[PDB]
């Protein structure tokens, strides 16, 4: 959305792209989706605290 028209994508499928962008394959996110989501939520809560 910052380089042209906004192209919709599911958030897990976008986190897959952002994992690929750092050198980690897509299956790492897809197989550990629940753990990654829980870690993200816990990190946000700890930021608030």
């Amino acid at each position: 959305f910052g380089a042209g028209p906004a192209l919709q994508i599911p958030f897990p499928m976008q986190m897959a792209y952002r994992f690929n962008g750092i050198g980690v394959t897509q299956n790492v996110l897809y197989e550990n989706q629940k753990l990654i989501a829980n870690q993200f939520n816990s990190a946000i809560g700890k930021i608030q605290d």
Partner: protein, 113 residues
């Protein structure tokens, strides 16, 4: 050079730049690539072949309603999903959104004839 920094050298994916002298300054003409004419497709994190999960190597799985193709994420170039397009990373039990489809083997038809 070509910069990957977002919005550093123009709105869009930077292609190149041209300098021009101006009174007491410089003028950069930023030539950039902007996507256009979007189209909506049904997508899938992975495709479940026989007892295996296939993820696209460099691309994304889309569907035109009936068939499943693998394309590049920045330009609609649908390709038939084969073994060279994807890679196997286990079975179809841990991926949420895995879709049943056939991955065509590029070697077996030639070997059988």
């Amino acid at each position: 050079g070509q910069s990957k920094r977002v919005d550093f050298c123009g709105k869009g994916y930077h292609l190149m730049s041209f300098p021009q002298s101006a009174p007491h300054g410089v003028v950069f003409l930023h030539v950039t690539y902007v996507p256009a004419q979007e189209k909506n497709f049904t997508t899938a994190p992975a495709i479940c072949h026989d007892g295996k999960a296939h993820f696209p190597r460099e691309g994304v799985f889309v569907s035109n309603g009936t068939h499943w193709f693998v394309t590049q994420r920045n330009f609609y170039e649908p390709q038939i999903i084969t073994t060279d397009n994807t890679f196997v990373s286990g079975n179809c039990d841990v991926v949420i959104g895995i879709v049943n489809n056939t991955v065509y083997d590029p070697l077996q038809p030639e070997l059988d004839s």
